[PDB]
Amino acid sequence: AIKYYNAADWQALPSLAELRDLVINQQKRVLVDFSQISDAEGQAEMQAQFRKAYGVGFANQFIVITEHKGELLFTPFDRTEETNTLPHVAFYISVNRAISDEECTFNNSWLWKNEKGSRPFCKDANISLIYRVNLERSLQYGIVGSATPDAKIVRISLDDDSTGAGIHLNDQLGYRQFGASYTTLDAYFREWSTDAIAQDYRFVFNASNNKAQILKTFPVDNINEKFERKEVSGFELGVTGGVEVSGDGPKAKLEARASYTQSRWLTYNTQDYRIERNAKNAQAVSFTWNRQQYATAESLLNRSTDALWVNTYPVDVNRISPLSYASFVPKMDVIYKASATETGSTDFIIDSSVNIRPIYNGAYKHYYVVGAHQSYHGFEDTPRRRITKSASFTVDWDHPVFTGGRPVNLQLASFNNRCIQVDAQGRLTANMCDSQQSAQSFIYDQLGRYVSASNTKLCLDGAALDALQPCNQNLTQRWEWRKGTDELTNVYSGESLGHDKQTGELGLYASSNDAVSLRTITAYTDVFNAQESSPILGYTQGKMNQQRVGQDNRLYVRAGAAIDALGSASDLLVGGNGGSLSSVDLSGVKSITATSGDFQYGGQQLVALTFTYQDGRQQTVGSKAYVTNAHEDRFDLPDAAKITQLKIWADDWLVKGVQFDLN
């Protein structure tokens, strides 16, 4: 049931929430058509409205929108072919390309190219992939040298949790035999052309301009053949944090108070292939799965000589691993960054391909005089054909999600609690509050400015309160709340934002009068469900890192006389480098008890965590043998509660405290 839409009709457009509800909640498959628009100006306008509304744009004529893993899935074409922790836009890009017989066709023979004809070397060859994309902001957190970056992020990846079907070339590898059309005494007389495999699989990532640079990727370098392992690619972003470290709520200025490690799980099983990483420059990087094991036709020979009366296929096709033609599922993670103040747009292109390689071997007839025989050989300089499928998406660096802040409103208490709202021209009015109206949403940024969420280029300016103004560095655009009151003050003049109780007109005042109120109420416009969690066990000292509990549902630790580090994976440990690695199962945990006190080797420390499970079993990390004047904080998990996130406080040497979030 595809719900067709002619974009030309909107030149008179549904919000993101509306689209997600129709596609995700109502499982409706949507098809947006841009090919009916009459001219370039009209197309550019709608394209601009489309991406401004949904956070992503395309230049393609058709866009199919479906659901995938709880997010929107965009399938563009031209012809008939965590949120509580980090604000972000997540979606997927689908790519499906059928490889035609013509595209898989090669000569039946190599030695006799123009004689034996040609045939398709693959059956139902296909490329079906799904790319996960996240648009998000990272704030600077930590000391210069070991801090998270202050940067707008575009993260693209092919991971275990959202992967598409993969690349297919053949179900099985068959062959055909051929022979010289002339007499032979000492020369090649027979040949076998085997169905094609992938000499390589390649994925190229590039950005359309220099506004974006590659920050990190996974793999970070080359990966050898016969490499089998589930890897984790973690990227640490500075975030504003919640109640555990930002006691001001909606009035808190955009500031990093913790870091968060967003992880992508990547399963590798390279077998015959080695993975070669190549970063040509700051905008482009490619990952190529190249045959390393049994890479030549010669290597496939399972016999070398025979008498002339033997006519047997001299190849052992079982030496070829199935990921070479049956099913291949790539895994990678690419993280692009742009400056904190970047503007405009950037396109990201993904080139996915398979280098199709037919296989040729021949038999050489040797003449000795008294006795003759044949020898088998492989031909390597034979034809290969790369079939590529590209896709691109456009990103606007001014999208509100890139501010890293949460939308909030400004309510005039004495004016029937109305919300300040901005129209297209930037004029201000006061209307009934409505969370579904972005025109009432603002981001309270780093400078203390109130940036319109519906147009990040405009700001609340004391210089002219009749309309928002192009954001700048002037103090007239920075606001500061007076603690203990509902009064919002202007940094430049020190006055308070007041509103006439009857007309709603805005102005700056030294104090309220009979006709004017200085009471401004602000609230988050997004509805956030309460997060249940244990108290902070231990001490709230040092930096805090947040990590989601992995699929393996285990807590990783390095400890000795105290607790050196903790993490959701052995490769994502936070804390010092001492202690010895250990692991704790989180399923069945009924209660957790932390031990803190005077540490034998200095100061106060969290020295141990004891976990008690439903069956009574207990496991402890750290020790109680090097602490005196100890104190025990015990947390009992609510019935059926499961640990899903970890908040870890640590300094350069030890974990200082931890908090466990539930469900």
Closer CB to ligand BOG, residue 432 or residue 581? 581
The encoded tokens of residue 102 equal 């013509």
Q: Of 527 and 625, which has the nearer Cβ to ligand BOG? A: 625
Write down the least CB distance from residue 565 to ligand BOG, Å: 9
**What are residue 594's DSSP bridge partners?**
609, 633
Of 138, 130, 137, 194, give the one whose Cα is nearest residue 162: 130
Beta-carbon contacts of 617 under 8 Å, excluding residues fewer than 6 positions away, are: none
* CB-based burial, 264-298: b 16+ in 10 Å, e otherwise: bbbebebbbbbbbbeeeeebebbbbbbbbbbbebe
CA distances from residue 227 to 286, 355, 376 in whole angstroms, order as listed: 19, 21, 31
CB nearer to ligand BOG: pick between 403 and 605: 605
* Shortest Å, Cβ 302 to ligand BOG: 53
Contact 122, 196 (CB under 8 A): yes
- The residue (of 104 and 654) whose beta carbon lies closer to ligand BOG is 654
Nearest approach, Cβ of 624 to ligand BOG (angstroms)? 12
Q: For residues 173 and 586, what is the distance between their CA atoms, to the nearest angstrom?
A: 46
Nearest-CB residue for ligand BOG: 578
Judged by beta carbon, residue 183 or residue 580, the one nearer ligand BOG is 580
Rounded to whole angstroms, how far apart are CA atoms 470 and 455?
A: 10
Question: What is the C-alpha to C-alpha distance for residues 399 and 41, in angstroms, rounded to an integer?
Answer: 22
Nearer to ligand BOG, 461 or 564 (CB): 564
Q: Tokens 């004689």, residue?
A: 115
Q: Which amino acid, residue 551?
A: Q
Which residue number, 430 or 561, has a Cβ lying nearer to ligand BOG? 561
Structure tokens at 523: 């609230």
Least distance from C-beta 146 to ligand BOG, angstroms? Answer: 19
Q: What is the DSSP string of 2-36?
A: EEEEEGGGGG----HHHHHIIIIIS--EEEEE-TT
Nearer to ligand BOG, 120 or 578 (CB): 578
Q: How far is the C-alpha of 99 from the C-alpha of 198, rounded, in Å?
A: 13
How many CB atoms are located within 10 Å of the residue 398 CB? Answer: 18
Read off the amino acid at residue 302: N
Comparing CB distances to ligand BOG, the nearer of 380 and 651 is 651
Residue tagged 């297209």 (tokens): 424
Reduced to 3 states, what is the DSSP secondary structure of residue 403?
helix
The distance of closest approach from Cβ of residue 408 to ligand BOG in the complex, given in angstroms and rounded to an integer, is: 43
**Cβ closest to ligand BOG, residue 126 vs residue 623:** 623
In contact, 655 and 565? CB cutoff 8 Å: yes
- Cα distance from N-terminal residue to C-terminal residue, the chain: 35
Nearest-angstrom CA–CA distance, 15 and 269: 42
Nearer to ligand BOG, 114 or 580 (CB): 580
Instruction: State the nearest-atom distance from the C-beta of 167 to ligand BOG, in Å.
Output: 46
Cβ-contact 502, 514 below 8 angstroms:
no
The answer to whether the bond into 219 is cis (omega within 30° of 0) is yes
How far apart, in whole angstroms, are the C-alpha atoms of residue 587 and residue 592? 12
3-state secondary structure 55-116: CCECCCCEEEEEEECCEEEEEEECCCCCCCCCCEEEEEEEEEEECCCCCCEEECCCCCCCCC
CB of 562 to ligand BOG, least distance (A): 4
Run of H or E residues at 464: none
Residue 144 or residue 625: which is nearer to ligand BOG going by CB? 625
Q: In the complex, what is the shortest distance from the CB of residue 244 to ligand BOG, in angstroms, rounded to a whole number?
A: 25
Minimum separation from the CB atom of position 658 to ligand BOG (A): 15
Report the residue number, 213 or 604, with the smaller CB distance to ligand BOG. 604
CB of residue 584 to ligand BOG, shortest distance in Å: 16
- CB nearer to ligand BOG: give 182 or 601: 601
In whole angstroms, the minimum distance from the beta carbon of 573 to ligand BOG comes to: 12
Q: What is the smallest separation between the CB atom of 555 and ligand BOG, expressed in angstroms?
A: 16
Q: Contact 556/568 with Cβ under 8 angstroms?
A: yes
Residue 560: CB minimum distance to ligand BOG, A: 3
Residue listed under structure tokens 């202690």: 579
Three-state secondary-structure class, residue 662? strand
Q: How far is the CB of 654 from ligand BOG (least distance, A)?
A: 7
| Residue ranges binding ligand BOG (CB under 6 A) | 559-562, 564, 578-579, 601
